[PDB]
Design an enzyme around this catalytic site. Structure first.
Site, short mmCIF file in Angstrom:
data_model
loop_
_atom_site.label_atom_id
_atom_site.label_comp_id
_atom_site.label_asym_id
_atom_site.label_seq_id
_atom_site.Cartn_x
_atom_site.Cartn_y
_atom_site.Cartn_z
N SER A 71 41.11 39.57 49.08
CA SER A 71 42.17 40.41 48.52
C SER A 71 43.59 39.98 48.99
CB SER A 71 41.82 41.88 48.81
OG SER A 71 42.58 42.74 47.97
N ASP A 116 36.37 44.49 38.76
CA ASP A 116 37.35 44.71 39.82
C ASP A 116 38.58 45.45 39.26
OD1 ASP A 116 39.21 44.43 41.92
OD2 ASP A 116 38.39 42.45 42.50
N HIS A 147 35.55 45.43 43.66
CA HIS A 147 36.42 44.55 44.45
C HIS A 147 35.80 43.91 45.68
CE1 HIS A 147 40.25 43.02 45.67
NE2 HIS A 147 40.41 43.82 46.73
#
Ligand code: A1H35
Length: 290
Positions: A117, A234, A264
């Site tokens: 991320s 996601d 995610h």
């Protein structure tokens, strides 16, 4: 009086590093019993901390890699106002300081990056700053393109802070149900006191928008080998960003694995997804180390 973490533990009792701004970063190390084949830095994402990577780090250490990490400024057990950064480049500078320090203690070893991320955006910018230096990068749902609906809303709120003096402005918190389909993992995330689950401050969201702009400019320069893992459902990092990274990076060794229906946080998803993620990372790093 000894300098302490934000949880009041003296840094003299913990592995640490002091950054260029004089801020203490809490560090973690997982070293094999023998001579390591390579080094690997793990870069965590926004709100979380390096302790969330215990299982992945122990798997990588089992491949005879020396795994290291720190909590980014404003996160976990490192110093700094929570989820605040003067400029996104601070995160990249601090990764580079730690990698440079480790390479002195373990010279001649290849060095890999692993990031998830926001941590994946940090890994991309770190590799782009040092072309040809890193042996490979493992990216789990890297922040390349934010969710289109969320980005447009935030870009309006960002204009309010950019045009006026509004220091305390925050948007809503990152919704925990969209992180993973594994409810037990979501419950654990919601229970860890080192995780910041407060609403994102507008100044910090502006730095994530800077990270997205910088990642876009860095792609035509990126040549490091990479493995990119991305979920198709996601809601935080739009899967279009992973396809864009596969298309625009110049890397001669690039691979994408899509997890259909996954959310995610792929390394904390349903067991079948998480087991595959660990296996795929293990194969990819094993093939590129010796
Ligand atoms: O680094 C990130 N963050 C960066 C992230 C993508 C961003 C999209 C966005 C943008 C972009 C620009 C501007 N914005 B923004 F500010 F407008 N914005 C707001 C909301 C999203 C968003 C917000 C997500 N994470 C969240 C985590 C995963 C979490 N976890 C750890 N263990 C677990 C277990 C339960 C499964 N979950 C911690 C790492």
């Amino acid at each position: 009086s000894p300098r302490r973490t934000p949880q009041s533990i003296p840094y003299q009792d913990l592995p640490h590093l002091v950054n260029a701004d004089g801020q203490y970063l809490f560090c973690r190390y997982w070293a094999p019993t023998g001579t390591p084949k390579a080094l690997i830095f793990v870069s965590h994402g926004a709100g979380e901390h390096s302790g969330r990577y215990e299982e992945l780090a122990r798997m990588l250490m089992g491949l005879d890699l020396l795994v290291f990490a720190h909590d980014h400024v404003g996160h976990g057990q490192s110093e700094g106002e929570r989820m605040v950064v003067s400029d996104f480049h601070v995160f990249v500078r601090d990764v580079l300081q730690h990698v440079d320090s480790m390479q002195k203690d373990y010279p001649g070893l290849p060095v890999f990056l692993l990031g998830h991320s926001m941590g994946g955006a940090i890994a991309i910018l770190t590799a782009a700053e040092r072309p040809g230096h890193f042996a490979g990068m493992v990216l789990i749902s890297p922040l390349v393109l934010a969710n289109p609906e969320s980005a447009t809303t935030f870009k309006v709120l960002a204009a309010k802070v950019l045009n006026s003096v509004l220091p305390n402005l925050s948007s809503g918190p990152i919704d925990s149900s969209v992180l993973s389909r594994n409810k037990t993992e979501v419950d654990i995330y919601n229970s860890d006191p080192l995780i910041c689950r407060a609403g994102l401050k507008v100044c910090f969201g502006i730095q994530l928008l800077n990270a997205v702009s910088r990642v876009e400019r860095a792609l035509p320069k990126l040549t490091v080998p990479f493995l990119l893992l991305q979920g198709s459902a996601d809601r935080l990092c739009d899967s279009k960003g992973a396809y864009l990274l596969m298309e625009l990076a110049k890397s001669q060794d690039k691979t994408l694995k899509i997890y259909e229906g996954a959310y995610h946080v792929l390394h904390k998803e349903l067991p079948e997804v998480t087991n595959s993620v660990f296996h795929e990372i293990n194969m990819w790093v094993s093939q590129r180390t010796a």
